[PDB]
Design an enzyme around this catalytic site. Structure first.
Site, PDB file in Angstrom:
ATOM      1  N   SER A 131     -20.634 -19.343 -14.772  1.00 24.69           N
ATOM      2  CA  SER A 131     -19.970 -18.511 -13.778  1.00 24.69           C
ATOM      3  C   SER A 131     -20.335 -19.035 -12.382  1.00 24.69           C
ATOM      4  O   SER A 131     -20.085 -20.204 -12.112  1.00 24.69           O
ATOM      5  CB  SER A 131     -20.250 -17.041 -14.060  1.00 24.69           C
ATOM      6  OG  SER A 131     -19.433 -16.183 -13.267  1.00 24.69           O
ATOM      7  N   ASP A 177     -11.350 -14.222 -20.454  1.00 31.95           N
ATOM      8  CA  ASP A 177     -12.259 -13.961 -19.341  1.00 31.95           C
ATOM      9  C   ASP A 177     -11.551 -13.061 -18.328  1.00 31.95           C
ATOM     10  O   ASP A 177     -10.490 -13.409 -17.825  1.00 31.95           O
ATOM     11  CB  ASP A 177     -12.693 -15.293 -18.692  1.00 31.95           C
ATOM     12  CG  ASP A 177     -13.893 -15.226 -17.770  1.00 31.95           C
ATOM     13  OD1 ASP A 177     -14.134 -14.137 -17.187  1.00 31.95           O
ATOM     14  OD2 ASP A 177     -14.627 -16.253 -17.697  1.00 31.95           O
ATOM     15  N   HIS A 208     -16.031 -13.311 -20.806  1.00 32.25           N
ATOM     16  CA  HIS A 208     -16.770 -14.031 -19.785  1.00 32.25           C
ATOM     17  C   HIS A 208     -18.094 -14.601 -20.293  1.00 32.25           C
ATOM     18  O   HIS A 208     -18.532 -15.640 -19.819  1.00 32.25           O
ATOM     19  CB  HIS A 208     -17.036 -13.141 -18.574  1.00 32.25           C
ATOM     20  CG  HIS A 208     -17.471 -13.917 -17.369  1.00 32.25           C
ATOM     21  ND1 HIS A 208     -16.857 -15.086 -16.965  1.00 32.25           N
ATOM     22  CD2 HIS A 208     -18.470 -13.665 -16.465  1.00 32.25           C
ATOM     23  CE1 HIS A 208     -17.445 -15.519 -15.845  1.00 32.25           C
ATOM     24  NE2 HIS A 208     -18.416 -14.646 -15.506  1.00 32.25           N
TER      25      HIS A 208
END
Length: 262
Positions: A131, A177, A208
């Site tokens: 991320s 996601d 995610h």
């Protein structure tokens, strides 16, 4: 200029929870320029190995990405997983901290009392993250083209333009996601890069956290991750097909690669 360690790989050996080398770990007592660190290393790789720094995402800690440490170290890498100075650090600050962790691994390589004294080839370094730590890793690669490889999962940054990256970059993306949606984040990041070996592997149905500790695709994700770093950090062509091939897997909803020979 190859740096080959360990036996010839198979699908089974790359998919297993552990590679050939026995692994140990320690907590960094005084982290320099980042919040906290755990170092995983092989006791018995039979030569110096490269170093990899792994950064988690926004609000996250080492536990989210920890599974990578034993997994990579067991195939012939010194791996540092870090916590950032703040859980709310943004990507540029995550990149600085990642490079500070690699710097400290190089310093410990030279410290006679360290468990990794003389185990690291400090010319061969790599970056990974999730991320915003994935964005941080791509900023590290853009800023430090001497890095040998990058492997990120569900990356995010405030810009998708990584057209300057010359570092061999693997992107894991998570199809469903909702935080960093693939089609407006990981995919345009992948598409921006025109000067490198690169790969894009989207996990079918993934949220995610689909590449985080405890995920259900550790066989495939782990295999691809290890193969990529082995191929590009060790220039180990025994891994060219594992690193570069389409797995043709019903676990993958989208696969793309460029400039990835054999």
């Amino acid at each position: 200029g190859s740096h080959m360690r360990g036996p010839n790989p198979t699908a089974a050996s790359l998919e297993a929870s552990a590679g050939p080398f026995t692994v140990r770990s320690f907590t960094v007592s005084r982290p320099s320029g980042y919040g906290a660190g755990t170092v995983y290393y092989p006791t018995n790789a039979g030569g110096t190995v490269g170093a990899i720094a792994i950064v988690p995402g926004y609000t996250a800690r080492q536990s989210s990405i920890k599974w990578w440490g034993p997994r990579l170290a067991s195939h012939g890498f010194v791996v540092i997983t870090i916590d950032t100075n703040s859980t709310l650090d943004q990507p540029e600050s995550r990149s600085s901290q990642q490079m500070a962790a690699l710097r400290q691994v190089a310093s410990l390589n030279g410290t006679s009392s360290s468990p990794i004294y003389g185990k690291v080839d400090t010319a061969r370094m790599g970056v990974m993250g999730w991320s915003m730590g994935g964005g941080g890793s791509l900023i590290s690669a853009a800023n430090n083209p001497s890095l040998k490889a990058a492997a990120v999962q569900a990356p995010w940054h405030s810009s998708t333009n990584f057209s300057s990256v010359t570092v061999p970059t693997l992107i894991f993306a998570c199809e469903n996601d909702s935080i960093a949606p693939v089609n407006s984040s990981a995919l345009p990041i992948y598409d921006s890069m025109s000067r490198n070996a690169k790969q894009f592997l989207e996990i079918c149905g993934g949220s995610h956290s689909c590449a985080n500790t405890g995920n259900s695709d550790q066989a495939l994700i782990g295999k691809k991750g290890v193969a990529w770093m082995k191929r590009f950090m060790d220039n180990d062509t025994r891994y060219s097909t594992f690193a570069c091939e389409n797995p043709n897997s019903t676990r993958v909803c989208d696969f793309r690669t460029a400039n990835c020979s054999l």
